[PDB]
Amino acid sequence: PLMVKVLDAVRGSPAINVAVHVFRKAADDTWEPFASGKTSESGELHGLTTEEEFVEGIYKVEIDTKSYWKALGISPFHEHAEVVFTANDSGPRRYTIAALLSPYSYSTTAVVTN
Amino acid sequence: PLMVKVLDAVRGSPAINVAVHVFRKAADDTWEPFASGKTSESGELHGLTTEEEFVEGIYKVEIDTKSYWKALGISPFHEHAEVVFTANDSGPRRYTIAALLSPYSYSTTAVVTNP
Amino acid sequence: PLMVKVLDAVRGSPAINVAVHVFRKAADDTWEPFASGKTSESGELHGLTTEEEFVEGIYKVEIDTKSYWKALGISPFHEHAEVVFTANDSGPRRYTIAALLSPYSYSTTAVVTN
Amino acid sequence: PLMVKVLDAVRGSPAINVAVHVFRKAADDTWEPFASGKTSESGELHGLTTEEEFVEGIYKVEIDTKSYWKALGISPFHEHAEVVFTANDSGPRRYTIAALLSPYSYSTTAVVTNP
Numbered sequence A, C: 001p002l003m004v005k006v007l008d009a010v011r012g013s014p015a016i017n018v019a020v021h022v023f024r025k026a027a028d029d030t031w032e033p034f035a036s037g038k039t040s041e042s043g044e045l046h047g048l049t050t051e052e053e054f055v056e057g058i059y060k061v062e063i064d065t066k067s068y069w070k071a072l073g074i075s076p077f078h079e080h081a082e083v084v085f086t087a088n089d090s091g092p093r094r095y096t097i098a099a100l101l102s103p104y105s106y107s108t109t110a111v112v113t114n
Numbered sequence B, D: 001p002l003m004v005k006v007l008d009a010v011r012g013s014p015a016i017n018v019a020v021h022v023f024r025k026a027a028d029d030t031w032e033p034f035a036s037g038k039t040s041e042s043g044e045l046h047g048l049t050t051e052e053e054f055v056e057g058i059y060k061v062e063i064d065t066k067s068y069w070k071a072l073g074i075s076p077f078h079e080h081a082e083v084v085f086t087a088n089d090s091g092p093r094r095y096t097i098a099a100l101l102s103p104y105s106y107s108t109t110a111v112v113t114n115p
Ligand SMILES: Oc1ccc(/C=C/c2ccc3ccccc3c2)cc1O
Pocket: A005, A096, A098, A099, A100, A107, A108, A109, A111, C005, C007, C098, C099, C100, C107, C108, C109
């Protein structure tokens, strides 16, 4: 139900071994840890959750961009990239959160398919 | 020292009347409200802070993209666009945070200048 | 050796049935037709060329963004999106040209892997 | 009526001294040179054209990204960034073409205003 894809706009490559943390907003308006992992050689993180676990709610995907740039010897601007969205059941739904990284910029899009 | 510029990639226009909230990370590791405002007819938000008040720290610029799209009658994907960065750690700098918005996407960049 | 991926930033979806034309710069500095197709249900165009055909040179990938937006009833700014690059043999190489489309904007990146 | 703004996503700075060439599609379907210039210390290129000269047509703004990166000693992917659009077909408009550059990527957006 949830896939994250990270790309590097400087090297023209997948962003490999990037830490990604997913949080779910709790009733108290705090961020509860939900799922995490590191992107693969293809810049992808699969297997974060299941259809049963991935209920409607507000989610935050935090991408550890700062550690990624520092490991390549590059000085980055952001502490991290955050993607905050509502999961809405309206029909069978798969969410791909994509991020394209530069040292002083990032782009993110959602690809939501059935 | 801190300016926010927001553009709309659907209309090809400035993003007008976008709410922006700035937070600064406190000693307790919580987000303290720092400043807020709305973008103008040019999509710009000036006057958030002063050189004196804009000290070193970790800042979060929250751009209320969902409220923007919903006011135009559109159901967007994201709740907001968050830009989190350390500022002024090598002395005072001027920061422009620019954002380009679509209903299911956004881009942000920083322009950092030494006055 | 060459894959094109097109995404829609308005709908949060692959950009389906987008016409893509690839040109190679000829000795006369004109653009010779090289490969073309339409993106699939996943927004991808595979099978454009072979390793034997895809020699070093300057290539142009033209994405018919205007027809895409018009088919969705949306008024777009650009006539097309053009991606112009040199193919360089430096080692085994696969090129993915990705484009993320909005009515008044687009982003493109290259993912070049071995 | 036509302004170009270029930013560098690696340095977090304006992209200075970027060559820009503008072409207009002729009756013969060829690209006629229209105007050209270089971005300033602010990454901006003003004064390309006038309201009188900037008639209806299909225009191509070519941003010489490869020459920019190569002058900084970097080997980039793209030859240039091309922005192709119909202009002034509903009367005169003001166009800002903005570009955000990385060695293997770029983003472009248009801001179109009615004077
Ligand atoms: O500005 C941007 C430009 C491109 C992308 C995404 C590109 C891409 C490329 C390949 C993909 C394969 C599977 C799923 C999503 C995939 C997404 C995102 C941006 O924010």
